[PDB]
Symmetry: C3
Subunit: 408 residues, 3 copies
């Protein structure tokens, strides 16, 4: 009964309110063991679909479109992601100079020391896109390796269509069809799961708001507005603009990508929302050849919301220390935060961890007694900021897919 897009908004609005209230009275623990579980069941159900829906769609997608086309689509969507994320940091910086988060704040040092996670070599990360066992990739998460194999297999099935043989052309057809069976079936699942969305959505915000809502005060409130205001400007000033320029009606784009944006925001998992954001890509009629490759790739490479969040935070820490950053250091943030964004995982609260990487680049390590005491303040309202960070991450992926879809 009832529309689904309506039910979510109710769950979201009524959820955010049931949370803030329960938590203000200290029931933050009662909400965690009682309400949250439902929000988790929603997440689990979505993660469930990611592997099959991604793999099966791309084999059909890579088999669908031209091998050179897919290659062009790739060069375009990568150019887009880089230019978006780079603009998102600079949009965050301009929000961190506009507002002043942690301007006249002095913090209690020594409270908590943080541990630096040593990053692996770029080379190793790149060669690890090519998986040594496809079955293993699928078996345990691993979206990007799967992306690689799927496209390869996709293109392989195509070349088996042109073969002179009858028995080869038939077996290739059969494989493709069954794989497409899975694909089609997976999108049908996302509908039924989207039915439990309102209940899940209610719970998910009920938890976040009860756990970190009441901490959104003082300088922590100012940084929160700084991020959200910026994010808002990323949508209006970057998406709504690039969409108009390319001849896509921005308003009916928001209408079609509503379920994706809200799942993203609530769930906090850029990757966990992927089956919803992939459906929404089918909804506005984009070709499987394009969205099937862009959305899963961008789900990891493209994070505007995260890049921006890292911008405003690198400025929060700097202001809390009392020393300002140079004209050239702000430009050194832009370039590092992009790299950090790309790096950030499609999972909740993964941007905050990556934030450290962009903190060394300016000149304020995370081991520094006081820096670490300021970074703990941010970490305390991180799930509040994360919801924003994720929504903008996802929007950017649809936007990019759309723009690249229209040009072809």
């Amino acid at each position: 009964e009832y529309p689904v897009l309506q039910k979510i908004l109710i769950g979201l609005i009524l959820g955010a309110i049931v949370g803030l209230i329960l938590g203000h009275y200290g029931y933050a623990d009662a909400v965690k063991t009682y309400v949250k579980p439902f929000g988790d069941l929603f997440v689990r159900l979505l993660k469930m679909l990611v592997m099959p829906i991604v793999f099966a769609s791309l084999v059909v997608g890579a088999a669908s479109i031209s091998p050179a086309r897919l290659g062009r689509v790739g060069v375009k969507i990568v150019v887009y992601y880089l230019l978006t994320s780079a603009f998102a940091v600079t949009l965050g910086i301009i929000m961190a100079r506009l507002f002043n988060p942690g301007a006249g704040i002095h913090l209690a040092v020594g409270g908590q020391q943080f541990q630096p996670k040593q990053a692996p070599p770029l080379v190793k990360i790149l060669l690890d896109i090519v998986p040594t066992n496809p079955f293993g990739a699928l078996a345990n998460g691993q979206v990007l390796p799967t992306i690689f194999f799927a496209i390869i297999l996709g293109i392989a099935i195509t070349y088996l269509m042109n073969s002179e043989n009858e028995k080869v052309r038939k077996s290739a057809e059969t494989l493709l069809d069954a794989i497409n069976g899975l694909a089609e079936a997976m999108y049908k699942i996302v509908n039924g799961v989207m039915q439990y969305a309102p209940i899940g959505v209610f719970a998910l915000i009920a938890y976040v708001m009860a756990e970190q809502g009441v901490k959104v005060v003082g300088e922590l409130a100012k940084v929160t507005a700084a991020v959200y205001v910026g994010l808002t400007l990323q949508i209006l000033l970057v998406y709504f603009v690039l969409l108009k320029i390319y001849g896509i009606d921005p308003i009916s784009f928001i209408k079609k990508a509503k379920d994706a944006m809200l799942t993203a925001f609530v769930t906090r998992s850029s990757s966990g929302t992927l089956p919803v954001t992939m459906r929404v890509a089918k909804e506005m009629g984009i070709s499987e050849g394009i969205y099937s490759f862009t959305l899963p790739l961008g789900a990891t490479i493209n994070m505007d919301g995260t890049a921006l969040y890292q911008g405003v935070c690198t400025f929060f820490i700097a202001n809390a220390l009392g020393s300002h950053l140079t004209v050239g250091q702000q430009l050194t943030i832009v370039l590092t935060a992009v790299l950090a964004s790309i790096g950030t995982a499609g999972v909740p609260g993964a941007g905050a961890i990556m934030l450290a990487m962009v903190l060394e680049s300016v000149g304020l390590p995370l081991t520094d007694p006081n820096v670490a005491a300021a970074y703990a303040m941010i970490l305390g309202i991180d799930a509040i900021l994360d919801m924003g960070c994720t929504m903008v991450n996802v929007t950017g992926d649809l936007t990019g897919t759309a723009i690249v879809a229209k040009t072809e």
Copy 2:
């Protein structure tokens, strides 16, 4: 050459005798490194099939039957399992008061202390039925998560059959067919494996009897009879009765579920026997829609033999301590042992571990110096008792599937 059902009985009877004899002369180690290996090869071969045969059968099964039907089947078979297991504990208690195992026994304390394995929250166990990656489920055991996904995919394929599109209805057909190919192929395997059954069966009892046969004396003999007598009464007084009531000839039910019962008994793995017990379900002509869902689920939820074993043992320990249990404590065993049974894994010697959980509930922890010295006595003949525990576990799953099958 020769019939298979005949060969097993020979292997079983001649195996049990070759074992008892070899072991009485201290060759318990000679049997383990020489004879057992063959019994293991039989187990490995059966485990081999479980994943494919379960998954592929349920996708076809869930796709076969009505979504509401499958749902009704579920409510019925769950009601059945609970009422069986609850009756099985009370049947065990009445066997533990009838016989008195460890009545006037005083044990050498301090011999061995046992370590309590802290259980996870019920919530966590329930949300973990919904897998976050189907490929992962399959990849590493995980029967229940697979059950969930398979049904979901099954129902998804069905809704793709009714689609207006031609290319969708065809791809959905193709997937289903191939998946069914696997299913059909897996049952054919179980035949060939059942051919090695006699050799395996011979070895498997040869080991159990040589390793723990000679320990079946004294108070350990009395508890052994107590369990077996009870188990026997579970079959005659609960299955043979509930089968007559529902209009199923009990005798030709035992005739058809012979291979399942014997594999179960010998193997000691409720789960490892699953491909045999699934074939036997096909043998008596039950629909894939029903047995495909009941048998794998009940293979973990339903354990009458284990529930009973836990009943008679909670009384063995209590009598060895010298203090009797209250009228209300016996009722507190019924309710805990059911929960423990459900909990017990479809693997050999897993009931004994769970026994601890039902031991705390009455008031005699497993850390208590002497309790633990009595529980070590039971553990010493556990594989003897386990064979019984498993057979009755499995019978109950077929029985339930049968009864639910007849009503529809």
Copy 3:
């Protein structure tokens, strides 16, 4: 553009030269972080294919040929592998007495002590060929377990073809076709990957030669010639001979198995080359029923090049110690080195580790201060020797497959 077989030879010859030169000037580290990566990308791409290409080909292969035929093929190819490997050790010994590697050498003791890796029981290794979860096998490497399941499934699909039912015979067809789709697609991939071969090949030798080329002097040179000369005699004196005897033109056999031999040599992974060596088996028109089963099995069981390498080395260590081995000890090497060869993994530098196993059997453990200081000399030029060891390993697998193919 350009032929592929020509490009490789250029990469190989020009690669070996760019390596030796760069390394002689100490750029061994510059080659490792700059050039090698490309050689790795080539390896990754090949490993990628192994699982799918092996599995899918054998299901179709086992389904293709007679169950008794496949069984005969097995007995023949096993007899062949054993007799080859046994002849390869004796051919190495005769090379180690012909040349005298480490005759008058006295080494600096105490430099490096090595750690013995305790081997598992033969029984455990044999029962572990039968996998307890096929999906797991595939999921993580595990070629032999996959081999077992694939054949079983293959034979199962066949028996489903003869069924009286229509819906069974169709579903069995569908499965087989799709699985064959994968198979066919995988061979098409190996072509495209073989296109990157020259670049990879260039880099791969560029690294090996820069890293261990300059160490190929003195007594280390003499043992190197001893191995290579022997290997050469294994090809001419064992393959070219057994091929003529069975009516196969040796020269156009080398022409067809060129890509396999060179990938093998460069890559150093007997297993990593398997998709190339499997294609080359298709190239000379052998049946999927035969090569699909022989090549992956022999890829682990059959290692002539490794067996020989172990022969000449067991003599190098013995001569460096100063005590000669008995007539009967040389015969005790033959029998142990075969077992060690079979044991050696289809991965780079795995023969050297196994060498230890055949070192205990004569009477000179690897823990012995000085033995271990001599074994470290060998380990230093091991990748040089490994390239030879691998090529001959692979050749032997094609040879055997060919000979068994002709007899049928």
